[model samples]
Target: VIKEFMRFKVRMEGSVNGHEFEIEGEGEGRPYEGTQTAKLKVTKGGPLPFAWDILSPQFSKAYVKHPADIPDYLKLSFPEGFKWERVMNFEDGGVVTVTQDSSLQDGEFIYKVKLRGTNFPSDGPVMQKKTMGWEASTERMYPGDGDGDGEAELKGEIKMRLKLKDGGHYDAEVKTTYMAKKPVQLPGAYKTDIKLDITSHNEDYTIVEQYERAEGRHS
Candidate 1:
């Protein structure tokens, strides 16, 4: 059985609404485990206009037996279904799928996720091509013996591209690093640290805004 704990210190900076915004936060999760819950706290800066989380639902699990089983996993991640809307401007519905890739880098594994659907009302205003995709990676830090000091580390980078129905598109990337410590003899308490950086660009490939923040377990 695979088991481990993680903690992350994170920093996020970016631009939205033509204004630069910065958010600092931290989160923790356990892959290959049940319920796979992650908690995030934004200590500073304004929250994004939309609901976004650094740890995507697909990242909560360590592995899936087959590509066909991904939708089941997504159910565990988002029980209420995933929807996208720009407050009152426009709304869309999409289905997400997670697939493992054949690429293996030194000490990490990769997954490709795609989201495709259509805008509201079949032909609503601001309707255009709607697509979003993500590439994510998870690193392996310990061996099978699990003789280590109940500690583990996870590092990954996520790239997301979205083409809105309003003829606008943006590309965003986030880098995350998590370190966790939970003594084998101690089962209930865990400590973690996470560091994150977020950047975004517009259709012209020019960075509109950048935000960075670093947070720890105790901080």
Candidate 2:
């Protein structure tokens, strides 16, 4: 009998100060709403030989082959449909601007995304890209202490909680949390707090797993 198959569903929810957004699409102004569907299959396991696919939007169409690249985000292998580009304003823009790229982590199951374009979150526009991967954990914590002041200090951790099930006999929820660095902006500029909701769903249109990413963190 086959032991493990990468068949599962995901639903992500992005939140900030009680505000929420969908999981696929541009966050837009203030709170963002975006959602995506993912289908993954684990070919091989261990330090190498693992693979997966994000299915929708077809972002990162590459296979993972290392350990250090294990992303703290999901814990599964990198997704195949992950891509990001900068929008250029021109009279007749022919080619899109390719700014940054992502690298696999050391564990060979995750990845780190880097953005190098304009209108970043620092400019009040929090643009981000997400994908599918191994089942990781999720955390929920407030980013403020409420000191009776005008603006509360921002702080919190990222957590991913997900589960997988199909004709197979695998059903469980995974969780993982990681710390994000503070957002950095140019002098005299204001950067709004952004949030990213990463989730999953099954072929039957049932929500299986859900993950969330808060704003105010730099890439």
Candidate 3:
């Protein structure tokens, strides 16, 4: 059985540059806010390219190549008085087997992270450049590396060298334990000397840059 065709008018209005748009239906109240908006002409039952995608499950939805205006998008999506802040300098982090061979060797840890995003003002894709340093106690991170009460020898803000190391990536998900260091400081400081454990999508591996230590590593 076939039903008769239906029809409804749709409207989309935006600025000259098309940086933002306001979408309104044929009814009373206006629909959809600004930023990341677009125009579409659907003749009642004409081919709607993205209709199926928009109807799929949340987790399996397809993502657009270009990023959105983070702040403007948030402002439109959130309430009038909503306030937010960012904790990290970057967003969206994950580590797989090989990315520029990123990894932590003997005593050298190399990290490389890439990001594609909208800069808002220029509204174009771009990148970043900065020297980053982080700390982790490796005493018990490797097998047979420490003894007795797990204490941290690499104490108090051990900085990484400016030179990018030879190696950069790996996939090592293992269990380990270690003692805490640093009692007090500012500019990203710790509060209490508490037990710290990490659980995330990060991968870790022990790479012995020295051939001498390579044989003795797996104990």
RMSD per candidate (Å) reads: 17.1, 19.9, 24.3
Candidate 1 — which residues are off by over 4 angstroms? 1-3, 47-219
What's the distance in Å from true for residue 146, model 1? 33
For residues 133-179, what per-residue lDDT tens digits would candidate 2 score against the true structure? 32332223233422334443322232222122222111122111112
The whole-model C-alpha lDDT of candidate 1 against the native structure comes to 0.28
Please report, as a residue range, the 10-residue window in candidate 1 with the lowest summed lDDT. Answer: 80-89
Q: Which stretches of candidate 2 lie over 4 Å from their true place?
A: 1-31, 46-139, 144-177, 181-219
Model 3 spans > 4 angstroms off: 1-102, 123-219
Clashing pairs in 3: 101-168, 101-169, 102-168, 102-169, 103-168, 103-169
What are the per-residue Cα lDDT tens digits for candidate 1 across 104-188?
2233322222222222333432122233322332222221222234543333343444444445554444333322222222111
- TM-score per candidate, chains pooled: 0.25, 0.20, 0.14
Better of 1 and 3 by TM-score: 1
How accurate locally is residue 14 in candidate 1, as Cα lDDT from 0 to 100? 38
